[PDB]
Amino acid sequence: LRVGNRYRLGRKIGSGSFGDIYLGTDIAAGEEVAIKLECVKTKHPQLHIESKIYKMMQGGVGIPTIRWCGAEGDYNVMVMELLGPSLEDLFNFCSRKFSLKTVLLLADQMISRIEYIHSKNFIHRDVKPDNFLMGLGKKGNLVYIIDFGLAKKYRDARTHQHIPYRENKNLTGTARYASINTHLGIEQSRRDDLESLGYVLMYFNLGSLPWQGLKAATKRQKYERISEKKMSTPIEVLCKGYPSEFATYLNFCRSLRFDDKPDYSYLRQLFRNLFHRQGFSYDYVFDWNMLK
Numbered sequence: 027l028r029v030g031n032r033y034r035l036g037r038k039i040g041s042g043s044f045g046d047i048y049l050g051t052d053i054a055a056g057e058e059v060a061i062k063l064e065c066v067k068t069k070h071p072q073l074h075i076e077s078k079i080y081k082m083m084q085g086g087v088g089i090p091t092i093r094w095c096g097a098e099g100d101y102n103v104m105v106m107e108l109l110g111p112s113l114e115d116l117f118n119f120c121s122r123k124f125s126l127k128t129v130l131l132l133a134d135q136m137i138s139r140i141e142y143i144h145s146k147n148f149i150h151r152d153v154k155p156d157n158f159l160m161g162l163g164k165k166g167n168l169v170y171i172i173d174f175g176l177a178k179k180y181r182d183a184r185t186h187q188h189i190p191y192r193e194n195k196n197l198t199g200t201a202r203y204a205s206i207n208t209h210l211g212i213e214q215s216r217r218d219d220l221e222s223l224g225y226v227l228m229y230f231n232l233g234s235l236p237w238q239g240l241k242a243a244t245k246r247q248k249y250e251r252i253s254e255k256k257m258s259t260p261i262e263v264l265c266k267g268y269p270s271e272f273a274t275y276l277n278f279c280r281s282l283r284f285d286d287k288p289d290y291s292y293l294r295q296l297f298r299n300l301f302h303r304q305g306f307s308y309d310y311v312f313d314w315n316m317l318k
């Protein structure tokens with residue numbers, strides 16, 4: 027099917043926080059693209075809201091370029107430059123084992139993406155391996171962040187007024203990577219995006235997390251059981267047998283005040299110093315690059 031007069035819509039490659047993802051073609055420029063379709067007659071319309079967030083992020087390192095946004099037949103449409111596999115897919119493909127070097131390469135960029143998003147007055151609130159994609163081709167060394175479906179302003183663009191402290195709030199993101207505060211029902215802010223990244227990095231290190239695969243009656247009960255496990259697992263127990271840097275990072279995030287601007291620089295320098303002790307070079311040879 028034609029889309030925006032110059033895009034041909036391919037096959038469904040997967041699914042977003044809302045809407046389905048297709049792998050299409052920019053017929054005119056001969057480039058493969060990604061196309062998010064959302065039903066026009068949907069009760070909870072978002073794509074246009076999401077689009078405006080992607081538009082504010084344009085020109086950022088590790089932000090996918092919008093090609094086109096429109097309505098066509100039954101569908102609202104966003105067309106992005108095509109990106110590669112997610113870190114969840116690359117991790118599955120690497121038998122759920124990343125070398126310390128890959129974890130440190132990823133962590134350096136991922137902190138930087140989260141910092142760029144915070145600089146544009148938004149929190150992500152669904153930091154998880156699925157929402158980081160590697161580029162293709164010459165961009166194969168770049169971690170991209172995607173999916174602003176659950177994202178939200180934390181400060182007014184002009185006044186930089188932080189949102190107010192609120193409690194009694196639905197766990198909206200992914201339970202596995204949620205901050206301890208998020209489980210307590212506190213409004214997500216910058217520190218929470220970074221805590222989540224912290225649980226994502228330890229997931230990369232361990233192959234899983236201790237609160238992963240908990241049985242219960244309902245989703246509601248499972249979340250409580252995850253909260254209970256997270257809060258009763260000390261950070262030094264989670265990170266036992268891994269470099270102290272992972273523990274130091276999570277401790278620093280758990281220390282951050284609701285409205286604190288995090289020291290992104292410090293946290294990058296944390297893993298950079300360890301990178302240098304380990305004698306690794308920043309040559310962007312990830313584990314999946316070594317497969318043959």
Ligand SMILES: CN(C)CCCS(=O)(=O)N[C@H]1CC[C@@H](n2cnc(-c3ccc(F)cc3)c2-c2ccnc3[nH]ccc23)CC1
Pocket residue numbers: 039040041042047059060061062090104105106107108109110112156159172173
């Ligand atoms: C349990 N299993 C079955 C579910 C796991 C979830 S999944 O669906 O397999 N995960 C992948 C789906 C595609 C990917 N993705 C999600 N949204 C966009 C997107 C595309 C266009 C757009 F305008 C806005 C956003 C993409 C995506 C896919 C490929 N290239 C991309 N260039 C920019 C986004 C993107 C995330 C990774």
